[PDB]
Amino acid sequence: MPSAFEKVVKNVIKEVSGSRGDLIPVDSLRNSTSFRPYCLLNRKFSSSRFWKPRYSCVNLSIKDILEPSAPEPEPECFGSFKVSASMNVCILRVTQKTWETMQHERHLQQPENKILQQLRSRGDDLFVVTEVLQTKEEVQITERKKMVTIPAGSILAFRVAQLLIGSKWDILLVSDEKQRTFEPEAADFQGLYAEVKACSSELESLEMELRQQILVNIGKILQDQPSMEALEASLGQGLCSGGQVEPLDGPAGCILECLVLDSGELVPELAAPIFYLLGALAVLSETQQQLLAKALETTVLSKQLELVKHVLEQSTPWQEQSSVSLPTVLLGDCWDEKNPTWVLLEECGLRLQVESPQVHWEPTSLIPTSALYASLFLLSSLGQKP
Amino acid sequence: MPSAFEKVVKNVIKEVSGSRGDLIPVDSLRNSTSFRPYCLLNRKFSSSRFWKPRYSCVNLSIKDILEPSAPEPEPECFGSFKVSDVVDSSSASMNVCILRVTQKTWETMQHERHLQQPENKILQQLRSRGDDLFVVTEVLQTKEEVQITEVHSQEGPGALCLKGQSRKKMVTIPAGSILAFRVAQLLIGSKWDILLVSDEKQRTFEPADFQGLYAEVKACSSELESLEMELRQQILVNIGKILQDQPSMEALEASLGQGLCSGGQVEPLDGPAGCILECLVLDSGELVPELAAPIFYLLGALAVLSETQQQLLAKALETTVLSKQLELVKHVLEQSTPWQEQSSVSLPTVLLGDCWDEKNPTWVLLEECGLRLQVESPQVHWEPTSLIPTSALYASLFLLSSLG
Ligand SMILES: [Cl-]
Ligand SMILES: [Cl-]
Ligand SMILES: [Cl-]
Ligand code: NA
Ligand code: NA
Ligand code: NA
């Protein structure tokens, strides 16, 4: 859904930074306080180069992992904008000189922080907020009647920099997608298909009874995000450490039981593709997850996958905004707002239309549409007959 | 080496807009007053799809061609920025702001104002020449007065003796100076319209790959190769003289453009511009289309090049060094496909007998195209932004060597 705050945040990013902007939108006003400059964010191990997991809050600042312990310098105000009925926003940034000074004056906390040890075990990546886009004044944005007030100084969007911590700490201002925080090539549709097909090949191999229970239990964990979140951490820690994993409760536990041995250690060939599939589902929105949990039959899933496959295949180059025409004749019912394939595509940030062209590609929509494609491909690959 | 201060302007654009392909950099502080919002700019008829002519100032505003005559609404201030990379014991920061004319302002102006019915004399002159008309829709200007110093890299004893104040120049930029701008092509006919989403195939007045670029230049060269050796040599030596005087080349271009779009007798010009015009014209005063069109293309390609690039070509007009420089540019362009991605190009062995360095003429010609050069493997760094000037440099070298 437009979520009111979610809709105003996307339009503000587009006006301030431009279409291919490197600004990440803030999910909610409650969480805004944790995305301030210098805040630390974690991300689960990146299983794919086409989709990335959402950033989570560590509720710690860069000073909390460095020595000597001291407050960070005040972020500089780069600029102000009148985004339009006029909302005033401003950019607070941590300069490169501030990072270089901090790297010279501060070193990693030598007896090692406990939170970093937890992230290292799960194979998570660590990031630091380098820039924020926040409101200057209080605005009363109105939405049914639901006036959402946004107070002054609210983080609407943010820029991150991956930090690499080992013997010394380093900040990646110019991002490198191949880098990992803790140390243990054309991006086209063809490479994306090969990556998902490699993961799908590992599935199918499993017995039809095993594939069906993993499939039905995925539909149950799609109802409970924290259940899926906990299962992901158990798999990530088991893959990065190789130790016995603690049994879980609910459908998360049932899926974990399928992927694990009599000793407690995960089977890497079974756990890795499931970790990829759960990571692709984590990228999707609540609405998208509840739709996939209903349409888990391989009949509708195959048609939805073919529509997403066509959208992605026709949107190359993925860096330009392009219009795509869809073969809606594939679907059993008419192409409208109530269609499940319309809702799955609209939740990816794609602007849809009733007819020719039906989809409007946005470069920003690559991360969720790759996750939706990989999710549909693997979920149909589980429910298929041998 | 910047184009006077172009590297500092490009750094400000990169920080403010994210990429270079959105805002056009202003050439000089003297001309800045003419690139303000609502100002009208003309661009000569586009002879090629790979290179585009520079925008010239009409020194008129949108209100000067519309009725009722009334001042334009004040442009809105979209935002302010504090840029610190202004060099290309403490750091240097400059405050800039963006002034924009909103789409609603343009739509309101289109509803309230119509074209000046007995027709503006300046529009008639641009129409006769086949020029395109544009309007400045957004500007990036300074908020405060900034003093930027320029440091000149050594320079030879002959270039210093030409002038003869030291290497460090104190340049003072006043508050409200236009550093960069965004344009919108306006289409004027029975009604006027503003193209906010640009269309490269559109003309104001209604009357791909390296292989396509090579074919376009080769077609132009085929026409020039049919001329007499004495006429080709006089056209070549006189091009080297008009390369010293930009306004002489600018006037000759307008005479050829108006003669091609109207087909009437052209008034004789003075200096080397006049000598070239005499070669392309009849006993009656009308241009020979087969002769004037390829020369118009060649002059348009030279107009895209910088002053430094033009002074280098005016010295190296012999077909000996010209052929080697053309081959280097041909290789850079051929290896940079696709042009949209930044790619590194490795230049082949024995570049010019002597050595590949900052003082090499081929290095300066390529660096003035926005290409970041390096002493060795890879020597060139392609930037998508460098397509317009490198196409013009290729076409210029190809046709100048084709002269003789
Ligand atoms: Cl987020
Ligand atoms: Cl892993
Ligand atoms: Cl210009
Ligand atoms: Na602070
Ligand atoms: Na089996
Ligand atoms: Na395509």
Side-chain angles (χ1 to χ4, degrees):
Chain A
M1 290 294 293
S3 169
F5 179 82
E6 170 255 296
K7 202 177 170 193
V8 300
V9 147
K10 306 302 194 299
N11 288 351
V12 169
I13 287 171
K14 278 199 290 180
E15 196 137 30
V16 166
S17 64
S19 187
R20 61 247 293 272
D22 320 333
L23 246 64
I24 309 159
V26 166
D27 58 341
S28 74
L29 258 174
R30 167 181 302 279
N31 300 338
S32 77
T33 321
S34 205
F35 295 104
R36 265 144 141 105
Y38 303 107
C39 290
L40 295 180
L41 308 175
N42 72 293
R43 176 158 86 177
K44 291 193 166 81
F45 172 77
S46 198
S47 312
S48 176
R49 49 194 235 258
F50 300 89
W51 52 257
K52 298 300 206 279
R54 306 170 167 271
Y55 294 94
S56 298
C57 295
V58 184
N59 296 309
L60 288 179
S61 199
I62 195 69
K63 70 176 162 48
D64 300 317
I65 62 167
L66 299 176
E67 183 83 10
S69 210
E72 310 92 352
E74 223 59 72
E76 105 167 7
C77 183
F78 169 60
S80 298
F81 314 95
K82 190 195 68 173
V83 183
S84 47
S86 52
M87 178 198 298
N88 292 305
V89 299
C90 68
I91 287 184
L92 298 179
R93 59 151 175 195
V94 181
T95 69
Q96 188 180 21
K97 280 194 197 161
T98 299
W99 291 121
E100 291 187 36
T101 298
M102 195 173 290
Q103 286 192 71
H104 171 75
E105 297 175 342
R106 311 183 194 193
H107 67 92
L108 284 166
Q109 271 172 348
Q110 283 154 30
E112 186 77 341
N113 192 294
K114 291 189 180 202
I115 316 301
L116 295 175
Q117 291 171 26
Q118 293 171 221
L119 298 173
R120 174 169 282 181
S121 75
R122 291 157 47 182
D124 284 12
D125 290 332
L126 195 63
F127 297 85
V128 62
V129 179
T130 58
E131 185 169 321
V132 298
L133 176 64
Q134 69 173 39
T135 66
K136 287 185 82 75
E137 307 155 18
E138 172 179 271
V139 187
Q140 274 97 338
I141 297 298
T142 78
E143 169 180 329
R144 285 191 168 177
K145 192 162 280 183
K146 280 107 175 63
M147 182 214 58
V148 180
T149 299
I150 302 168
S154 296
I155 311 299
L156 303 165
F158 61 97
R159 164 171 294 166
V160 292
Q162 185 182 12
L163 46 97
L164 314 154
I165 66 158
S167 73
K168 185 61 188 54
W169 70 277
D170 197 27
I171 176 174
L172 289 175
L173 306 140
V174 177
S175 87
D176 200 349
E177 303 80 22
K178 315 158 191 203
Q179 282 301 122
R180 256 72 192 174
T181 280
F182 307 97
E183 314 300 328
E185 312 181 31
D188 51 359
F189 180 67
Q190 304 101 70
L192 178 266
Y193 169 69
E195 188 198 72
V196 185
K197 189 65 198 72
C199 180
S200 172
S201 74
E202 301 176 336
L203 274 48
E204 297 179 22
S205 318
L206 338 180
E207 293 96 323
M208 68 226 82
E209 312 120 344
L210 195 63
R211 292 195 290 137
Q212 284 316 118
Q213 282 309 299
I214 288 167
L215 176 69
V216 72
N217 281 303
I218 285 169
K220 300 173 187 189
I221 54 170
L222 286 168
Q223 263 75 273
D224 204 83
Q225 193 84 279
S227 284
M228 208 195 307
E229 215 194 64
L231 174 62
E232 263 288 282
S234 297
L235 296 178
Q237 192 183 11
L239 291 172
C240 278
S241 314
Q244 304 164 20
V245 81
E246 262 60 40
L248 295 164
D249 204 304
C254 299
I255 293 168
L256 189 59
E257 282 194 359
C258 303
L259 313 171
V260 96
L261 288 176
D262 301 42
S263 66
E265 306 173 26
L266 291 173
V267 176
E269 309 92 74
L270 298 181
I274 298 297
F275 182 83
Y276 182 97
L277 178 55
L278 291 162
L281 308 188
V283 178
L284 304 172
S285 63
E286 180 206 62
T287 292
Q288 265 168 322
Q289 287 169 346
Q290 306 284 336
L291 286 174
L292 302 176
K294 294 178 188 84
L296 275 182
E297 72 260 6
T298 205
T299 312
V300 160
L301 248 157
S302 283
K303 297 193 223 193
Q304 295 182 339
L305 169 64
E306 178 61 33
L307 255 67
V308 178
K309 177 208 175 182
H310 191 223
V311 164
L312 289 173
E313 213 168 341
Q314 297 292 316
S315 290
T316 54
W318 289 326
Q319 276 62 227
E320 318 294 303
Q321 298 176 129
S322 52
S323 298
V324 177
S325 272
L326 270 182
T328 66
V329 290
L330 181 59
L331 314 174
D333 67 327
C334 51
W335 186 244
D336 59 348
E337 312 92 274
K338 294 287 189 166
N339 194 285
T341 320
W342 179 296
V343 183
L344 289 171
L345 290 171
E346 199 182 47
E347 286 291 305
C348 301
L350 302 169
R351 179 170 43 94
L352 300 198
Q353 179 169 324
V354 186
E355 79 279 53
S356 324
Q358 295 100 324
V359 193
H360 173 82
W361 179 260
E362 295 283 350
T364 85
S365 315
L366 180 58
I367 299 294
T369 317
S370 306
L372 181 60
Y373 175 83
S375 305
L376 291 166
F377 199 108
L378 306 171
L379 289 178
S380 71
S381 171
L382 278 175
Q384 60 157 80
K385 44 97 63 79
Chain B
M1 306 285 301
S3 293
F5 81 154
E6 217 180 38
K7 266 290 201 68
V8 170
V9 166
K10 283 180 301 167
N11 286 356
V12 171
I13 294 166
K14 278 198 291 188
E15 196 138 34
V16 166
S17 62
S19 48
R20 291 183 173 174
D22 39 41
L23 272 72
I24 309 159
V26 166
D27 59 341
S28 73
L29 257 177
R30 300 187 177 202
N31 299 337
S32 77
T33 174
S34 205
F35 294 103
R36 313 203 73 83
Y38 303 108
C39 290
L40 296 180
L41 308 176
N42 72 294
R43 182 168 78 177
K44 298 200 257 71
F45 173 76
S46 193
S47 312
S48 176
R49 47 195 236 258
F50 300 90
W51 52 257
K52 298 302 205 84
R54 299 173 175 271
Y55 298 97
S56 297
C57 294
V58 185
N59 297 307
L60 288 180
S61 199
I62 195 69
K63 71 176 161 49
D64 300 317
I65 63 166
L66 298 177
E67 183 83 9
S69 210
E72 310 92 352
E74 223 59 72
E76 302 197 349
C77 186
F78 169 66
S80 298
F81 315 95
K82 189 195 296 171
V83 300
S84 185
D85 210 36
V86 293
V87 168
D88 209 323
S89 290
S90 64
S91 197
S93 66
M94 177 198 300
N95 294 304
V96 299
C97 67
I98 290 182
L99 298 180
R100 58 149 70 163
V101 181
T102 70
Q103 189 180 20
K104 281 196 189 180
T105 300
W106 291 121
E107 291 187 37
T108 299
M109 194 173 290
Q110 286 192 71
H111 170 75
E112 297 176 342
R113 311 183 194 193
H114 54 281
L115 285 166
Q116 271 172 348
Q117 281 273 324
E119 187 76 341
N120 188 280
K121 290 192 184 171
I122 317 300
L123 294 175
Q124 290 171 216
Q125 191 55 84
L126 297 174
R127 174 168 283 182
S128 310
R129 294 172 181 173
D131 284 11
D132 292 331
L133 195 63
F134 297 84
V135 62
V136 179
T137 58
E138 185 168 321
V139 298
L140 177 62
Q141 69 173 39
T142 67
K143 288 186 83 74
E144 70 203 346
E145 173 177 89
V146 188
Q147 303 104 280
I148 296 295
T149 65
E150 181 251 348
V151 173
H152 197 85
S153 196
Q154 192 59 64
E155 214 170 11
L160 292 181
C161 179
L162 250 36
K163 298 191 169 188
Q165 185 216 99
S166 58
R167 285 174 67 168
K168 214 173 179 181
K169 272 88 168 77
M170 184 213 63
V171 185
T172 306
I173 315 163
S177 296
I178 311 298
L179 303 165
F181 61 97
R182 162 171 295 254
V183 82
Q185 186 181 13
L186 47 97
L187 313 154
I188 66 158
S190 72
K191 318 292 175 189
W192 69 278
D193 198 26
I194 176 174
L195 289 175
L196 306 141
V197 178
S198 87
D199 200 349
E200 301 82 22
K201 219 86 76 52
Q202 282 302 121
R203 256 71 190 173
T204 280
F205 306 98
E206 314 301 328
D209 64 36
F210 178 68
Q211 186 67 25
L213 178 142
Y214 169 69
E216 188 198 71
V217 185
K218 189 65 197 72
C220 180
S221 172
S222 287
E223 301 176 335
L224 297 176
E225 285 179 46
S226 67
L227 282 174
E228 282 85 1
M229 70 225 75
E230 324 265 9
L231 294 177
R232 281 196 300 171
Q233 284 314 120
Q234 203 200 113
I235 277 174
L236 177 272
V237 71
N238 281 303
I239 285 169
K241 300 173 186 188
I242 55 170
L243 286 168
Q244 263 75 273
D245 204 285
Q246 193 84 279
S248 283
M249 207 195 307
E250 218 148 291
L252 174 61
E253 263 288 281
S255 297
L256 296 178
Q258 182 175 2
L260 291 172
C261 278
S262 315
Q265 44 191 351
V266 80
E267 205 92 312
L269 295 164
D270 259 52
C275 299
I276 293 169
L277 189 59
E278 282 194 359
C279 303
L280 312 172
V281 96
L282 288 177
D283 302 43
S284 65
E286 306 174 26
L287 291 173
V288 177
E290 308 92 74
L291 269 107
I295 297 298
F296 183 83
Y297 182 97
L298 177 56
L299 291 162
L302 255 303
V304 178
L305 304 173
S306 63
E307 182 205 62
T308 292
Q309 265 168 322
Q310 288 169 346
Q311 306 285 336
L312 287 175
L313 302 176
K315 109 178 179 180
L317 274 182
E318 72 250 328
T319 205
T320 313
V321 161
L322 226 36
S323 283
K324 297 195 156 194
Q325 294 181 338
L326 169 63
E327 282 301 318
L328 255 68
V329 178
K330 177 208 174 188
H331 201 98
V332 164
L333 289 173
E334 213 168 341
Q335 298 292 316
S336 291
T337 53
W339 329 94
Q340 295 187 358
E341 63 172 356
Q342 299 176 129
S343 52
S344 299
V345 177
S346 292
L347 261 51
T349 184
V350 54
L351 289 154
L352 262 180
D354 196 33
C355 52
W356 185 245
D357 59 347
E358 25 275 88
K359 294 288 180 186
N360 194 285
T362 320
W363 179 296
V364 184
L365 289 171
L366 291 171
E367 198 182 47
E368 286 291 304
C369 302
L371 301 169
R372 182 171 70 223
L373 299 198
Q374 178 148 27
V375 186
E376 262 315 309
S377 322
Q379 295 100 323
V380 318
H381 172 82
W382 179 260
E383 180 74 15
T385 242
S386 315
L387 180 58
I388 300 294
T390 317
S391 306
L393 182 60
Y394 175 83
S396 305
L397 291 166
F398 199 108
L399 306 170
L400 289 178
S401 71
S402 178
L403 265 166

